[PDB]
Every structure is written in structure tokens, then in C-alpha cells.
Description:
The structure is cut from a larger assembly and holds two copies of chain A.
Chain A: E1 39-42, E2 45-49, E3 53-59, E4 64-72, E5 84-94, E6 124-128
Antiparallel strand pairs in A: 1-4, 2-3, 3-6, 4-5
The complex binds beta-D-galactopyranose, magnesium ion, manganese (II) ion (2 copies) and sodium ion (5 copies).
Residues 347, 569-570, 572-573, 575-576 of chain B line the site of one sodium ion.
Amino acid sequence: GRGPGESYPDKKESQRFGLYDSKDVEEFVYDYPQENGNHTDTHFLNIKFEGAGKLSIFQKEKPFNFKISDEYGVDEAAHACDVKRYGRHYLRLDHAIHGVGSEACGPAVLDQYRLKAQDFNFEFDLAFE
Amino acid sequence: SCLIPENLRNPKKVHENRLPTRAYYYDQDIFESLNGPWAFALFDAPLDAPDAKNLDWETAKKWSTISVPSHWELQEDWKYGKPIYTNVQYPIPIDIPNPPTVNPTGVYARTFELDSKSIESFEHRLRFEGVDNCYELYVNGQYVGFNKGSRNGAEFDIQKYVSEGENLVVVKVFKWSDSTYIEDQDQWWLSGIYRDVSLLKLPKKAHIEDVRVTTTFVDSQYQDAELSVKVDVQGSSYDHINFTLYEPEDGSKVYDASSLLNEENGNTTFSTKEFISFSTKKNEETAFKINVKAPEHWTAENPTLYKYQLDLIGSDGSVIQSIKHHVGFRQVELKDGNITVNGKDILFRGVNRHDHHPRFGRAVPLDFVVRDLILMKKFNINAVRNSHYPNHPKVYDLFDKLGFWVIDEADLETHGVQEPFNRHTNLEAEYPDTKNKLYDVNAHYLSDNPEYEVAYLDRASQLVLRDVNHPSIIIWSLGNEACYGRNHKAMYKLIKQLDPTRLVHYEGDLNALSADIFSFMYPTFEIMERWRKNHTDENGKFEKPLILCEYGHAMGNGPGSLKEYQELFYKEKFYQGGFIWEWANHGIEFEDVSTADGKLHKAYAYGGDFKEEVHDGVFIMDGLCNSEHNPTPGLVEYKKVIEPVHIKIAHGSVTITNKHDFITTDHLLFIDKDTGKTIDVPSLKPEESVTIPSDTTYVVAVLKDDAGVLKAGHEIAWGQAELPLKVPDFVTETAEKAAKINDGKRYVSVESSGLHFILDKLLGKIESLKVKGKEISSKFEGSSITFWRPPTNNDEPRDFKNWKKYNIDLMKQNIHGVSVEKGSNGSLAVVTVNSRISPVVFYYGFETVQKYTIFANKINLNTSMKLTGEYQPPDFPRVGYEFWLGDSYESFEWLGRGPGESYPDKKESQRFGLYDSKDVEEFVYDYPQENGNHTDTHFLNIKFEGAGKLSIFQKEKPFNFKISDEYGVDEAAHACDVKRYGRHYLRLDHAIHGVGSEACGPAVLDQYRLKAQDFNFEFDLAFE
Ligand SMILES: OC[C@H]1O[C@@H](O)[C@H](O)[C@@H](O)[C@H]1O
Ligand SMILES: [Mg+2]
Ligand SMILES: [Mn+2]
Ligand SMILES: [Mn+2]
Ligand code: NA
Ligand code: NA
Ligand code: NA
Ligand code: NA
Ligand code: NA
């Protein structure tokens, strides 16, 4: 998919397509904790387990979004050090994600990047090696 | 300690309500199998398990099922945990006699149907062939009894508890108990009902309980024998017994898996050829003794058996019960200080065999045991030691029929008591003549502990009484590595009392105070030899002989020097041979992520793979066969050294000596392999020899006809005349051809017609050598001459440590000068390289001169290496060149030893011949290590696709070579972890270090060590 860093519907084109390894990437820490670490236009995701191979994940007919982290309490966290962390990781596996825009000062997320309220239909395979 | 149940912490509570041990006989009419799926649940500890006195079938019915027999650490998806491997160390804390409070408890349940008539007709028993570690038994919500002894059997009377219709059997199985302390064999820790369970239906009013068969020669000349038969009948309602002995079937009988496993009787008419009959009379002793006229001897080389039928007969004259079995006429004695069978002082050509299967563990299907034993016979083995416990009772008939000398061993090892001592005192090494003093200090915990006497005696009683009628068993053994104490003496007394006919072995009893035999494990020759002399008096008499119950540790590449052990065996009457440790690697099949691949592969697990708290790593992988129970080069070598016929060819003569104990050479066809025509060889008795004049180079001794489990044409023994190193008649092109020579800044170039030679002066590296369409180049990382090999299991404890310490893997070639001159005596050019070959951080190294003499069709490489500097390593793994082979490379062919690998102290089974790489299956080691070397190579031909061959040979002396594409062997934990290049390389070596057995035993013997010294050798690279 897109990488090496994070990507969003209206902020993704600098992240070229390729095969990426989590180990090769320095995850970006925001000064003010907020939504981060999403990968958009993901063709497939491999999750490696110690001595048990990989879990391959892909979405039918359309690329998907994902984040893998151990973080929480990001909403209330004022600074990087305020961010809480679980004792295990989670996968956030998303069909779709709202754009990012510049509305703190400037235009709202453009119409074609807004995740508009509508019906959702999507199929995922969880393929185990 | 009320949170651990009394019976799990009481050494005297060996069983409750178990029937006395009797001789095992399988009978299809009496044995009903209870194997199959059983309800099963696992609990953290006994207190979480249900009270079986209240457990309904309706309740148990709802549990998951497990299949009996099997271990619960070997289930689909490891549902009930994983195997644990320890060698010495206990996997629990030591607090004798307490097990851990957290103690895995498995509860088994199933039902069986009983008839109205069945309860009237039969006494009903339950028989369990083996359950690890111990268990309590319930029938119909009622407690029947308790049992300990994981590899012993147990019977329980069920008559009182049985009901018409549905009956419920519940078995509570515990992983740890006081028994754990005496079950510490170097093997996998595995639990559950791992052997057969049976319902026995014996005739009620009267039935045969026990039988005892002995064959004793009346005479000093081992001819006439007394056959004694003692029957214990239970109940009153019988008249007498009949005995019918049948005419013998010669030990050369043909068998196969099918006929060996056939269990049919009842309506099958056992035999017809009646030899002897006998009847007891009403109200008389149900035993007798009969004089037998010059019977056919039973022997491991010729296992001749007389079948018999024993009938219990009622008042009406009908047959109440039959036993169909066999007699083996043989007698074992300690005679003139030797173990003697039928007067003859025998030689053990033995092996230690554990119960192991790569998928089922110790729950080995009989099919697979037959596989083991056939393979043993195919590789010249004649003896088996049941290390270190009795096997499934049905195995012993296999020994009887196939012919093995058997040491049946008590289920008792106490080794773990030593571990804290070993660590506290920083103990490095144990030696066979001295080590018993280290065990003496801890004997008081168990083997000298009076609380354990009942248990120790039980292991002895159970061992002997179950297997007492098998002629193949000639020695009872008190266990393994359990120190020495009063309990061992008690065991000895009991065994002689129960079975006076056999000898007693116990290695832990150094001075054989309560044993009949001396026994060492892994001794040096010096140590064997001192012992001999201290136990041979002035007359030349000895009182007891020495065996090696374990020697030639077969872990990985090895063992080395089986030759030198064997020379000792044949030389002295005092030595009666030994048993290799071990028959097969204990690998368990599992899925490993590959280091090379990032993918999942089938592999064979040892310690660490199942992520144990404590484990002993690769030490489980120490067999002559691999985890899949197939021959390694270790077994191939063993077959040769122990071959029962010697064939020597020298001075226009073939000398053939018969090295069997009993049989002649008559069954063997001797072929002159140079002509294909047979050699007429007279019938040779044990120890007899004949010299036959002949022009032959290579003689083979082969089986005339199918016999036992061996096929006509099977190779028993062979010999060769020594092959002189002949210089191949390759024609060097010395014609005057102009050559373009460019001695550049860094690279030197020699170009001629069909030739292109480029050398990097900075590195001493051949960038490219392309002669007549064939290309090679240096495989270069630091040096053009390298010294490293992937350490064997034997290398690991010392030699590897030394080589690593001295940085032998980091040898660098530092070029000082390169000299370039025009050719002289037919040569095109002479390129001379002057350098120091030395590892970083060290002084020591070789002042080296490499002289390349270049011809149109040949390159002569003269290597001079002069060892210099302070602080030198003692030895090297190897010394030689590494070359990349060009893309055209397709196969190779060599004159030398083959078809498999060979090493200085492990080579004689690989006979001289011309071998083709295509005809050979390359052996894969379970643990990746040094492999695939070919020693004593006369010449090597490397074939390139549509470009002919490159012939390689060393002047005045044969050489060593390996051709592979493999790397990353050092770090590879399993076969699947081994990395592979996109092209092949040649490892071309002047010399190579021996292999030895130092993982456990003697170091590589002095004459096989590649000692640090100057090296001088010349190679020709001849291009077709
Ligand atoms: O492989 C090491 C072997 O060493 C012996 O001393 C022992 O009796 C064997 O059972 C095994 O532990
Ligand atoms: Mg041991
Ligand atoms: Mn803060
Ligand atoms: Mn591996
Ligand atoms: Na925040
Ligand atoms: Na052990
Ligand atoms: Na001998
Ligand atoms: Na071992
Ligand atoms: Na390795």
C-alpha cells in the first residue's frame, strides 16, 4: 500500500505504493496527541506472530485503511507523555476514514474526502498461514 | 502437606489393589481392547478434579474426547500443553518425596458393555500397559485401586464392581508424584495413558494365572537339556494340564512386519509337527521337568524356536484355556569371568533403544518397533538395551523371533539429584573409573533411602516377572544413573531369587558388589585398559567381564573412532563389546518459522523449541538414526566396524575370517567384484580363517537366500585392496602459444586462446578464471584459504570454543607482493602471491606463497604455508580453498570414498570407487552442522553444461572436498533454517579435523586431529 508513513484520503499522495515493513519505519509522534498512524489504500496487510507465521488481511474489490498501535487516551492527552499504552497491540481495520482538511483555520474537508453518512458493504478475508 | 494428596507423596504407596505381576501372554480370546476415544478433561491440580465416586457417565459424556493410547502433550494444536525436555535436571523443585502442588491432572472416562452370561462365565480384569506418571482407577463410581511405575503394566480385579449392561471406567492420571524422582531419564517428559488398555475375560472357575519356562543344559557339552514348565492355576475346577512341544523352525525363518504382528489364534491350528507331549495327572503338581534330546540352540545369530501349546483341561476332558508360545533352548552363565551363552563367550554388537516416535512419542505403534528392529538387523546389530525401562510387552516376542541379545532394564533413574551438586561444585567432567564418588555423596536422598526400598523392589519385581520367559533377554538391569545404595543391593537379591537363570547389570555399581558384570559408559582406551589390568590376576584370570553399556555417542556428525573401540573388543577376552548411545534422535515433528525464509516449515523439535523453563537443548538428538528413524552416516559406519566377517586383501590373497559367535559362513555368497564371479569359500566356523590366492581388488560377502528379515543379496561384509594414488593421464598443453599479460595497477590479467585469468592483487582473489567455456572464481570473504566449518555437535563443547577463541573464522589474507612473469617450460605465465594469512587481533598466522603456473588447458597451484607467531591455536577445523562454480555447473563425479560423506575418523564404511553426484541421496542432518565432505579423494571431475569437465587432483596425496550451495549452517537450528546461494561452490581442502565423540565421550584421537603446523600442497586444475 502507501508508505512508509501515515496516509489519509486528502493527504496521501506523498506516500508512494510499495511493500513496507513496520520495522523500517520511525512512527511519527505528534506534539499534540491526535488521530495518527492510519494507512490508506492498503492492498493487503501481513501481521507476523512469533514462531507462528503470518495473518494476511485483505478487502474485496477495494483497498482498505488500517492502524496498528498500543495507544489509548489520546483524546484527553495534552502532550506526548500523557498518552496511555495497553499491554498488547490492537488492529484498527477500517473500510473507510474521514479526510483531514484544514478547518482549524481554513476550508473544511472537501466533499469528495468526507466520509458521508450512507450504507456500508464490505468483505474481509482473514487468511492464516 | 494436605493440599497435596497422601498417595502422591508416599514412596511406599507403590500401588493399591494391583494384582501380582505375572508372565505376559497376549490371547485374542481373553484380551478385549478398550483403546479408542475416551472422555477427557485436564485440571490444574488434583483438588480441581471431580470426586470420581460421584461422576456419572451423563456428566463425563459431555467432555471433549482424547484417543487412548496417546500422550496429552502430543495432541492436535497442543491442546493440553507441550512436551518438556530435560536430561539431568528435574523439571520440578527437589523436596523429596513431595511433588509440586500444581500438578496437571487428567481424568479419563469411557463405558463398556457387559452381558448377563459374561459375569457368570468370566473373572473380569482391567490391564493397563503403561500410564505416566500414576493413576487411581474407578469402576461404576467405586474406587478400585491405585498404581505407580510408568513403563510397567498393571492388572486390577473388576469382578466385584461390574454390572450387567453399561459399565463406567474412570481413570484419574497425575503428572507428578514421589515417583517422579525415580523416573528422570534423559528424554521427553510426557503424560497420560500412552499404552494399551484392555478388558480381560478369564474363565471363572479355573484359569491359568502364571507360567514359567526354563531351559537348562544337563551337561558340560551343551547337548541334552532339561525343559522345566511350572504352571500356577487359579481355582479348583480343573483336572490336569497338557503340554505339546513342536518340531523347531530354524532361526533362518523368513519374517515380515505382517507375520511378526499377526495376532490370530483360537480356531487357527497352532502347529502339527509334534515333538513331545506330556500330561499331568488329577490332583498332582501342575508343573513338570522333561529331558530333551539334543535340541536346536537358540541364539541371536540363529533364533531357532520350538513352539508349544499348554492346555488346561477340565474333568469332562474339554479345554478350559490354552497358551500358545515358544521355547528358546539357550543358557546364560558367568563362566570363567565371561558372559556366556550355551558355553560361548559372546560379543555385543549393540545399541540403546528408547521408545520414540516423532509424532506419538513413547506411544509407539508396534508396526514402528518392527521397523526399528528390521533396520537394526540390516545394519549388523545383534543386541539391544532397553534404555532405560521396559518396552510394550508385545515387543519381546520380536526380540525372540528376530534374534537380539537383550538387556531388559528397570524403570529407575535418579540422575537429577546430582544437578545442584554439579553446579555448586562447578563440576566439569565425569570419568567412568572415578565418577561414582560424586554419586556416593547424594545417594542418601533416594537409592540409599529406606523409604524408597519398596518402590525400588517393585521396579525390580515388575521388570522380571512380566518378561521372564523371553529367551532373548539374557541380562536384567537395575536401572540407570541412580547412584549406588542399599536399595540396589535389595533389588539384586530379589532378582536372583525370582530369576536365578540370568545375570544382573548395574553401571552405577562400579565395583559390581551387587552386579554380575562390569559396565562402563564412554570410557577412554586408557581407562578401559587400566580396569582390565586391575581385574586380571597374575594367572590371566578375571572374575567378571567388562561391557560398554553406552559408548560412541552418536550425536550429529559422528561418532568418530568406532574402529579403535572395535580393535580393543576383538583383542581382549575381558571386553565383550558394547551398546551405542543411541538408536535414534528423539525429535518431535512441529512447525518452525524459517530463519532463511520467514515461512512455516515441518521440522524436528528438541529442547527450547517447546519454550520450556529449563531444557537441555539438542542433547535429545543423539541417535544413529534421525528423528524419523532413518539411517545417518553414523549407522552406515557402525555396520561396517561391527561386520561379523573380516575380508582382507593383500599380496595376491584374500584372507577371510569368520567373526560370528555361533553361525558359519555357509549362508553367505562371496563375490569377486572385479569379475562378478563367485569365490568358492570353504565353510568357516567362528574364529576360523582361510587365505585364498586371487588377483581381486574388491570382495563382497552377501546373503545367498532370504533369511530372517533380510533379503537374498543383502551385504553383510566386504573388503578392498588398498588403492594407490594414480596420477591421471591428463595431457597438459605445453605448445608455444602467445599470451597477453597485463600487470595492472590492481588487477593482473592473463589472456590466451580459450583462457582468461584475472587476479585481484589487493586481495589475492581470483576475480575470474574461464578456460574452454568453464568458469570458476574465488569464493572470498577475508581470505583465499579458509579454515572454518560449521561446528558439529561434538565440536561444540571444546574444539569450537578454542577455534572461536583464536578467531579462526576471521582469518584474513594480507597481500605483501605479487610477482608476474612470462612462462618458461611450456607455461603461459607464472603469477606468485606473497602474503600473511592471519586472523584479526592475533599474532599467529602463515607466511604464505601461492604460485599459479598457467597453461592453455591447466592451472597448477602450489601452496606453501608457514606457521609463525606467538599464541597459536592447537588445531584447525580444516584448511583449503573455496571457489564459486560458474552458471554452467551441473554435476560432479569423483574417484575416492563414497557414496556418502567421509571424515578422517569416520570413513571406512565408504569404500573406494568412482561415484556420481546424481546417484547419491545427500543426507540432511536434523541439526545443521558440518556435512558432505569426501575424504581420501583421488580426483574430482566437475561437469559443466555443454563445456566438458574440470578435473582436479592433488599431488602425492589424496584430498578432501565438498560441493554445495548452502550457508548459514552455524546459526541454523533446523534443516529449514539453512540458507542457499544462487550458485554452487567447491570447498577444496588439503586437510580436515576429525569428528570424534566429544559431545559425550573422548575427544578426536590424536592421529585424526588437524594439528597446527606448516602446510604444503599442490593442486592441478585441469580443463577438458
Ligand atoms: O546423551 C547423554 C546420555 O548420557 C548417559 O550418561 C546416560 O546414561 C544417557 O541416558 C544419556 O543421558
Ligand atoms: Mg542421565
Ligand atoms: Mn501533559
Ligand atoms: Mn528453526
Ligand atoms: Na489530545
Ligand atoms: Na529427564
Ligand atoms: Na572380546
Ligand atoms: Na541424550
Ligand atoms: Na547449527
